[PDB]
Amino acid sequence: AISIKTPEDIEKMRVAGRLAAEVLEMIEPYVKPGVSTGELDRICNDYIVNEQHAVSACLGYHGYPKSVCISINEVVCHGIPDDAKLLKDGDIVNIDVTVIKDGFHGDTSKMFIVGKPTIMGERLCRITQESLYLALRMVKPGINLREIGAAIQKFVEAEGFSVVREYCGHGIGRGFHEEPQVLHYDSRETNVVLKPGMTFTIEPMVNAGKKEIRTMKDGWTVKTKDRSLSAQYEHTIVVTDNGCEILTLRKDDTIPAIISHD
Ligand SMILES: NNC(=O)c1cn2ccc3ccccc3c2n1
Ligand SMILES: [Mn+2]
Ligand code: NA
DSSP states (O other): OOOOOOHHHHHHHHHHHHHHHHHHHHHGGGOSTTOBHHHHHHHHHHIIIIISOOEESSTTGGGOOSSSEEEETTEEEOOOOOTTOBOOTTOEEEEEEEEEETTEEEEEEEEEEOSSOOHHHHHHHHHHHHHHHHHHTTOOTTOBHHHHHHHHHHHHHHTTOEEOSSOOEEEOSSSSSEEEEEOSSOOTTOOOBOOTTOEEEEOOEEESSOSOEEEOTTSSOEEETTOOOEEEOBEEEEEETTEEEETTOOTTOOSOSEEEOO
16 A cells, blocks of 8 residues: 655655755766766765765665666666766756665656757756646645646647656655656556655656657666657655645755645
8 A cells, every 4th residue: 555654754754855865966066078977876876875874775776786877868767877978068967866864765866967058958857847846836635646647748748748658756765666656647547646644756757759768788778769858857755734845855946845735
């Protein structure tokens, strides 16, 4: 079933969420033309282990080789940090962080634009974050996840973009991926009414082109089939009595931590 976190458990999620968010705030200065995704991964890992005294939940997850996922341009998700892959002017890059602290998970990601941003790259990233924000503004007890997924899809497609179907948001806590599944599109299978205490992620993956994806032969990297740009933003939240609280909020987020509907 779906778990309703306790006040104590929620406090632990606040800590884990903050740490995840701070990894993203910490790495920002290093995301510039010339750096390798491999070094970026090392930097994130050292920070998590030595400074936050936490652990990367991704490192080794189902056999994943690195501490964070770094996806560039047409890569949709799970990009594998590589010492030989260098960021270049105009790139859009997602760094997906997941930390475990005191038994609980904090899951978040954001887009970074490298060097001189291209108008389109800036547009895809802006719209993708807006779709996440729009969804977060809908979160409150009584609402069905199907509604939220439908709203994200409607917004995204109105921009000429598409929503990746193979990946979704998810419940989160002592487990990395717990129930429920949080689709970012309208599905006839989705029927989940939100309840206070539920903790999950919303992490829409949006393609500039078609929704179809392709997995590489390294068993992890995923790209858009048509090789169009893809962007993603993610936040871990807890449903409150009449809204929600974003546990992974950053200084650059342009949305409040507490979203009440009173
Ligand atoms: N924040 N993004 C995520 O939810 C995420 C991030 N990751 C990273 C690796 C991975 C490996 C196997 C299954 C899922 C994952 C995964 N999910
Ligand atoms: Mn996630
Ligand atoms: Na991408």
